[PDB]
Amino acid sequence: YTNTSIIAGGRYFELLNETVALKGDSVNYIHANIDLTQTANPVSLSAETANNS
Amino acid sequence: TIKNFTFFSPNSTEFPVGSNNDGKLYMMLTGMDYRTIRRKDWSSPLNTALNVQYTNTSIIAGGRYFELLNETVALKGDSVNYIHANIDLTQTANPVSLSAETANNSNGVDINNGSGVLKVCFDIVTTSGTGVTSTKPIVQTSTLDSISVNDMTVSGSI
Amino acid sequence: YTNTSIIAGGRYFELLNETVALKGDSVNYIHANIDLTQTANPVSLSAETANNSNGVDINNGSGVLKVCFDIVTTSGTGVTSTKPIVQTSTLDSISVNDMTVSGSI
Amino acid sequence: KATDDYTDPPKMYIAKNNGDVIDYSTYHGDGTDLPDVRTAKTLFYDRDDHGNPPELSTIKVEISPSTIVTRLIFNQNELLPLYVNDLVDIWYEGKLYSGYIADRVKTEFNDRLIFVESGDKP
Amino acid sequence: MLEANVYDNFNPNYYNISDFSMPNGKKEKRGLPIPKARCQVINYELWETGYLYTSSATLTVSVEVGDIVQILFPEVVPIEEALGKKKKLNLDMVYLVTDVDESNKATLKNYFWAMIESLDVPNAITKTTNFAIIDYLIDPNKNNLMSYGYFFNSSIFAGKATINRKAETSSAHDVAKRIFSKVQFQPT
Amino acid sequence: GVRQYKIHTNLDGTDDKVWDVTNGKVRFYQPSNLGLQSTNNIWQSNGIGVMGTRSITQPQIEFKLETFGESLEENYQLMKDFVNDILSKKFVTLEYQTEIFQVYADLALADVTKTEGYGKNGTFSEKITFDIITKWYTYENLTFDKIQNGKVIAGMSKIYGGTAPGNYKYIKGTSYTYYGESDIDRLSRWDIKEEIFSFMGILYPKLPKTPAGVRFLDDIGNEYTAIVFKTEQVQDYILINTDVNDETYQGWKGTTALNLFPVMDFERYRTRIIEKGQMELINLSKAEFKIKRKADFV
Amino acid sequence: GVRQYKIHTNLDGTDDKVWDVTNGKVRFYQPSNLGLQSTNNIWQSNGIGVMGTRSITQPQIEFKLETFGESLEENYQLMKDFVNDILSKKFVTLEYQTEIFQVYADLALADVTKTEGYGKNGTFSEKITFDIITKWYTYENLTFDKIQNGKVIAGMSKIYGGTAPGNYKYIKGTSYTYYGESDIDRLSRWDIKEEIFSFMGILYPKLPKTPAGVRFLDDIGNEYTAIVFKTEQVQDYILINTDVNDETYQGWKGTTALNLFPVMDFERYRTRIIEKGQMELINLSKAEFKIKRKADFV
Numbered sequence A: 001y002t003n004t005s006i007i008a009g010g011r012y013f014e015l016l017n018e019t020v021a022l023k024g025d026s027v028n029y030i031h032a033n034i035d036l037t038q039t040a041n042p043v044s045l046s047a048e049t050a051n052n053s
Numbered sequence B: 001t002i003k004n005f006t007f008f009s010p011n012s013t014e015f016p017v018g019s020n021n022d023g024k025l026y027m028m029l030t031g032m033d034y035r036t037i038r039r040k041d042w043s044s045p046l047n048t049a050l051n052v053q054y055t056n057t058s059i060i061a062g063g064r065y066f067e068l069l070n071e072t073v074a075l076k077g078d079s080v081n082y083i084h085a086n087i088d089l090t091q092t093a094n095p096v097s098l099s100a101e102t103a104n105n106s107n108g109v110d111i112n113n114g115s116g117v118l119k120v121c122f123d124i125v126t127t128s129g130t131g132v133t134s135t136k137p138i139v140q141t142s143t144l145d146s147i148s149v150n151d152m153t154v155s156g157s158i
Numbered sequence C: 001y002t003n004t005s006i007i008a009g010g011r012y013f014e015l016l017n018e019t020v021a022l023k024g025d026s027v028n029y030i031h032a033n034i035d036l037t038q039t040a041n042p043v044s045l046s047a048e049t050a051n052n053s054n055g056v057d058i059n060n061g062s063g064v065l066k067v068c069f070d071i072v073t074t075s076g077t078g079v080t081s082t083k084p085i086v087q088t089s090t091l092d093s094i095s096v097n098d099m100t101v102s103g104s105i
Numbered sequence D: 001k002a003t004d005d006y007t008d009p010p011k012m013y014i015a016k017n018n019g020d021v022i023d024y025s026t027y028h029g030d031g032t033d034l035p036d037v038r039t040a041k042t043l044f045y046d047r048d049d050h051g052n053p054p055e056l057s058t059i060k061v062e063i064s065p066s067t068i069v070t071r072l073i074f075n076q077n078e079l080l081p082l083y084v085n086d087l088v089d090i091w092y093e094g095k096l097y098s099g100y101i102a103d104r105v106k107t108e109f110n111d112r113l114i115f116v117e118s119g120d121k122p
Numbered sequence E: 001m002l003e004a005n006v007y008d009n010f011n012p013n014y015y016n017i018s019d020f021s022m023p024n025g026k027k028e029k030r031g032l033p034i035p036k037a038r039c040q041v042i043n044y045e046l047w048e049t050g051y052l053y054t055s056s057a058t059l060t061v062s063v064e065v066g067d068i069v070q071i072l073f074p075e076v077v078p079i080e081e082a083l084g085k086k087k088k089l090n091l092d093m094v095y096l097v098t099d100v101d102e103s104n105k106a107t108l109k110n111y112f113w114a115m116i117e118s119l120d121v122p123n124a125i126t127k128t129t130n131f132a133i134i135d136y137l138i139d140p141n142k143n144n145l146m147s148y149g150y151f152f153n154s155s156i157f158a159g160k161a162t163i164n165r166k167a168e169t170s171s172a173h174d175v176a177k178r179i180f181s182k183v184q185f186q187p188t
Numbered sequence F, G: 001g002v003r004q005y006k007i008h009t010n011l012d013g014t015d016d017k018v019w020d021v022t023n024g025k026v027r028f029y030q031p032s033n034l035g036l037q038s039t040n041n042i043w044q045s046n047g048i049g050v051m052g053t054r055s056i057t058q059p060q061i062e063f064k065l066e067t068f069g070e071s072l073e074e075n076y077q078l079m080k081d082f083v084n085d086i087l088s089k090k091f092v093t094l095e096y097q098t099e100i101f102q103v104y105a106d107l108a109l110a111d112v113t114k115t116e117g118y119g120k121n122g123t124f125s126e127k128i129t130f131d132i133i134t135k136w137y138t139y140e141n142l143t144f145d146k147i148q149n150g151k152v153i154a155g156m157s158k159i160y161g162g163t164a165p166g167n168y169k170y171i172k173g174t175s176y177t178y179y180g181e182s183d184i185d186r187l188s189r190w191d192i193k194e195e196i197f198s199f200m201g202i203l204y205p206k207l208p209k210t211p212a213g214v215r216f217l218d219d220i221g222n223e224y225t226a227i228v229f230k231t232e233q234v235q236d237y238i239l240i241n242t243d244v245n246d247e248t249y250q251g252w253k254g255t256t257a258l259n260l261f262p263v264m265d266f267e268r269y270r271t272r273i274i275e276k277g278q279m280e281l282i283n284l285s286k287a288e289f290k291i292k293r294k295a296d297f298v
């Protein structure tokens, strides 16, 4: 993600040259994960086997 | 926890049995609830105008035994009175009290386990303006699971 | 048993928050066991595979009285049904005004 | 008959705990009267000269239980000695087994007996 | 180590009865029981499909012949059941206990191959599509073991079934092996 | 003070010659191992440890056997008398005694050595090895317990006393506590507190032709095992021994000993291992029991 | 300063008798090996080496067990007490303590020796061998972490302040940074930083009939394992132990202990091994955890 902005749960963040590793021969569901207890890095991305919203 | 009662105490402290513990025991032996009683008139109660004196009547209400020895109950003029036995355990000096009420106000309050005042009707007194016209006693219900009997006599119906 | 009173062999006792452990996927026969030699704790409860009531005369002789009072059926996870044991009244001659029968005579 | 083939679907037959052989479709019970384990087999039949399907009793023979008999080989008890060809009833670990003393092994160290249950219990 | 759920034999003489009362009201087939014991699998060789070798494992609880062993993994497998539909399926390795030795090392046979055991299939059934053979093979009314329906990818079993040698009566094992070789798939 | 070792020919029996190996002419010194070994079956997968069942193994006991005779004739006479006494009985009971404990072991003679390296007046220094049947078991005396009637006190017990026609008051804590039972002398408990393996109980029967023996009850009042005999005449006492090695059952009448095994109830006698609960006497006026329960390490 | 060795009968349990094998009457000396052995499965093709998986094998620890009694009676009394206490519990926990660390081992009695070579006042010098179940695990108290609101600063925080009607400025780098969150007392993280094997949690449940128990989240906020129970009444506390050898899942209410195994969700409880992430409490008012985490060499 070269320059993508996302609003999730009313929280704004930017993906600037953020790479997500994928599973081969698969349908990858890209998720934005917000954990407010992780003070320094509250947002992380994941590639999952299903839509786990 | 298991609370044992009909068992001897060697150090004379192990198994003490209280009024409520025996009260529950007596209820199970005869097969009665808090809505019914065990009543026996050793001598017929006297009727003096709008008053009813119980000469010698023993009553077991909620497994608690008590005797009425020349106890007079005040009655309402030209009405069908319901004589109730009122048991309030908080009154340590006088737990049992009697009352003549307008309708049958049997509450069936569990006094042996929980708190409250137990009210239960035992005698129905029909009165006129002057005195007592007729008296009908409340039926003594004996709830049982199974009976193994030799012979039986029924005066009413099955 | 939160608050259950039992009379077994004419002996009165109370079960106040008394828990009995059960066998899974089974019919559990709940027994009251009375051993008078166990001075401090004469009564104990058991969950058994059969009705093992023994009719031991504890008021006249020695021995442990075992009497079944409840039947508790289980699944692999918990209780599915409970059926109490019949309370028998053995009498010689009865004089009665009225009677109601729910089962049969 | 029309196809001279097995075109028609199969009929499953189950043998109950008592021994009664019924069609599986006809069963209306709770499983308590059926075996705890299912050992299955596929059987092929040819229609008779009349054309009628094979009898229930004939299928029963090919799906019948065999005589399960317990064999106990044990040391000789000097308190109650047992010898060859003696009709006996043995109590072992709370269970009763009935049969006969079939053999006896004479070794330098011990003396043993083979107990063979004759069956025919129920 | 790996976590194992030990259940008693999934007897179809018991579980293939539609007497279970559902919360809505209607009657459905008896559901699977709770594990009689939760144990842990050590010193193991576990096969996913059991195409060539039979599995083996030493279990903590004293399992016996007939019992069903469910090996658990803290991961999820996504299976596509419909063109667009995918379902969150938890990773499992389900086996039947065939034999236990003195040292409690159990010989495990993959549930499917232990289910289609002793079942024979005539040439008449092999005449139709591969779907008809799968629908015949998986049936709790015939099988030695209980089954609550199969999940199958239509595209792979769409093709016409392989031609039988001598047009004889083959076993469920031999036909499945012949079909699974051409379709290039294995059951789990 | 100091440790006493004793070798017994027939411990729990009448014909028991005792050899004081600590004190006497023949002596046991420097035991090899009095401890124990255990195989726990611990298999580990990925650093985490799983434990199986521990087979508590007992190792051979080897003693430095020295003789203390006065002549070559006396030392040869000890070695011959001692070793043959151990051979005459199929198994020999050892006794480990100290200030705190007295335990027993049922050794079987594994190996004894005889060499020509004689010390003064033909004395001996030899090694005697034993194989273990049972390592450490107590030999306690088992007796019944009696139940006593609680004392009668005014106001605390159930009596109709004082002013006529009697009075008993309900009070919080004091109320009415029953005194005892009419004929409390009818209650006797033979209490079993720990699991036992073998026992030597002498039992005297009451009535002939009535099943006589002991039955065992578990903690819930259910029977698990019962040694029940049926007799034609009253045997003065039944001498039953549960030891596996020399199991003995015999009804004594006068000076005659009769084997009671075929006349015993085989269905009732389910196990030898006695569990925690109680023992009841069937058709018995009196009984004297000697209990022998285990101890792995002492 | 110096090393402390301690033997625990039941670590993580109320009935924990501790034996000071460094200071007490019964002492452990000269451990055989405290290190480790590993089998790397190295197979070599044409001089080039390929390495498989390392099975870290733990070796038996043999201690020179010495007793410090005052009399023959006291030394015999120690050997009988110390060895039987180890036998009473299926496995014993060692405590390796030093200036820098406090590690624990789960030992099983392999071999103990008893000989008649007494020193002074019946002193004992014997070798005790142990089998390794789990070698070196930290036993620590796991607690949740709280999140606190950052301080409010003029110009730096998002506020409309100073001259009316409030002004917040967009600067380069300093700009506007949010102070904290309203009700930041709702955020609590039970943090898992390293892989843990077993744990002893005391769960305090809130609502009855609602699945009460802990679940574990991975680094992406998904669930892998969950110990969840659905009870009929509110348990005062659920006691859960993940130890392989003695798993406990009991719901205590008052003085009564209830087995929670059949009520547990078997499908949700996928693994015992807890991975890096966070723990979530399902239907719980309070929680108290004790985490044990393995270390191969210390």
Ligand SMILES: [Sr+2]
Pocket: F010, F011, F012, F013, F243, F246
């Ligand atoms: Sr003997």
Ligand SMILES: [Sr+2]
Pocket: G010, G011, G012, G013, G246
């Ligand atoms: Sr523990």
